[PDB]
Amino acid sequence: MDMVTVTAKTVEEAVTKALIELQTTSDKLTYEIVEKGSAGFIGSKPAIIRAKRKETLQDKAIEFLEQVFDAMNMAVDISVEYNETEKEMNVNLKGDDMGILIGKRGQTLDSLQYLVSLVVNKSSSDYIRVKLDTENYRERRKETLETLAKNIAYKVKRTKRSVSLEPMNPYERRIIHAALQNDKYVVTRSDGEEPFRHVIISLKRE
Amino acid sequence: DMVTVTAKTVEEAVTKALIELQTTSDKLTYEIVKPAIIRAKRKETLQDKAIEFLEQVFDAMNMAVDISVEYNETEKEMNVNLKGDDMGILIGKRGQTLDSLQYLVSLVVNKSSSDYIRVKLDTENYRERRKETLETLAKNIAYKVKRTKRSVSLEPMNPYERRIIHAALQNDKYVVTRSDGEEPFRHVIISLK
């Protein structure tokens, strides 16, 4: 936490001074009063305050996540774009460690996202949309799954033998189901208890 | 940090306070430093590690909960229960939040493990109570739909919940189960026939 300490004739002035040096605005300032001054002709004594910028909402997201990734013994670069008027935060995670959890990225982006959102939203009277992603992983994940869907349809279609995908979170499972929604030769249906729950692709009947 | 033991080489020394500290070979860290001495502790428990992590996350959310964690080693399985007044702030949310915490915690525990550990997170049996009042919900709309002969859309819910519904009317010899909508507005639709 930044906190600059400022000094001046009265608390009132100190504040104004701090606003200038903080380049913030009245509605964006926290401060604590160290000492209100005095004068006495002239036993004068400056007023002193300590002041930061009032903490931002992206501030609170980053903080939460650093706290969590750190708890997870992981190194990650967080950055956020908040669109005030549109009321959405977009938070990108790049970083060497982010790379490790490969398949596991989906659900981990998901959980973390859900949480970051509780956190941001409890500090906010308006509802905020927080999206938590890595270098377009969500999109590029979607493509590759939709591709998986199509390729392994071909396989069933061709080998006549039924194929079970690896386990996946429901969100992804849906991408598959949908990818094959109207395939003339193949059908999909998901099985298993979580988290070993998968889609099965097999040839359509009747 | 650690404690000191002295014997013959390092091995007669290794076997030493392995006894004194009631621990076993797999769980014990070792510092290789007429005499012969070493340093050793009994390494961080998976519970120690689960509690650690959650403790940290709840700290980050400004909540004070009481975690407790039973762990059946032979089964390689760990049950975690949290509670306390502060869990009131999770009222509507509970399930999602419980699931999201569950995932990251499992994530952490298995990192620090060779054999795969199956971990479940739950406040005070909520998990089951919730399954129950949903199955009940399923059956009541089931009742209702064949009574209006029409058809109804339930509220939005996550997939986990949606499965619970589908499951409940899976056999229901008079009415159909269809999921629909777009997250976070995906719902089940029970329809006649």
Instruction: Give the CA dihedral A133, A135, A141, A142, nearest 10 degrees.
Output: 70
Task: Specify the amino acid at residue B142.
Answer: A
* Residue A149, CB-side half-sphere exposure with 13 Å CA sphere: 23
Residue B93, SS3?
Answer: coil
Range of the domain at A47: 2-54
Best residue in B61, B63, B101, B102 to probe A by mutation, most A CBs within 10 Å? B61
Q: Quick one: B7 and B48 in the same domain?
A: no
CA–CA–CA angle A185, A190, A196 (5° rounding): 140
The CATH number of the domain holding residue A172 is: 3.30.1370.50
Residue A82 contacts residue A88 (beta carbons within 8 Å): yes
Q: Quick one: B3 and B37 in the same domain?
A: yes
Distance (Å, whole) CA A163 – CA A153: 9
Report the domain count for chain A: 3
Per the DSSP assignment, residues forming a β-bridge with A131 are: A90
- Residue A137 touches chain B, beta carbons under 8 Å: no
Per the DSSP assignment, residues forming a β-bridge with B185 are: none
| Token couple for A101 | 């959890």
- Dump strand ranges (E) for B109-162: 118-123, 151-156
Q: Which residues of B touch A107 (CB under 8 A)?
A: 103
| Token couple for A46 | 């400056």
CA distance B19 to chain A (A): 32
CB atoms B93 and A68 under 8 Å: no
Q: Quick one: A21 and A77 in the same domain?
A: no
Is the CA virtual torsion A94, A62, A168, A195 positive or negative? positive
Q: Quick one: B116 and B53 in the same domain?
A: yes
Given resolution (angstroms): 3.0
CA distance B92 to chain A (A): 12
Residues ending a continuous segment of chain A before a break (C–N > 2.5 Å): 41
What Å distances lie between residue B185 and A132, B159, B177, CA to CA? 19, 11, 17
Q: Which residues of B touch A63 (CB under 8 A)?
A: 60
What is the experimental method?
Answer: X-ray
Q: Quick one: A70 and A44 in the same domain?
A: no
Q: Which residues of A touch B104 (CB under 8 A)?
A: 68, 72, 108, 111-112
Per the DSSP assignment, residues forming a β-bridge with A78 are: A93
Residue B49 contacts residue B106 (beta carbons within 8 Å): no
Q: Quick one: B51 and B16 in the same domain?
A: no
Cis ω on the peptide bond leading into residue A46 (within 30° of 0)?
no
Q: State which residue of chain A sits closest to B110, comparing Cα positions.
A: A72
Distance (Å, whole) CA A111 – CA A80: 18
How is chain A classified by DSSP, letter by letter? ---EEEEESSHHHHHHHHHHHHT--GGGEEEEEEE--B------B-EEEEEEEPPPHHHHHHHHHHHHHHHTT---EEEEEEETTTTEEEEEEE-HHHHH-STTHHHHHHHHHHHHHHHHHHT-SS--EEEEESTTHHHHHHHHHHHHHHHHHHHHHHH-S-EEPPP--HHHHHHHHHHTTT-SSEEEEEESSTTS-EEEEEE---
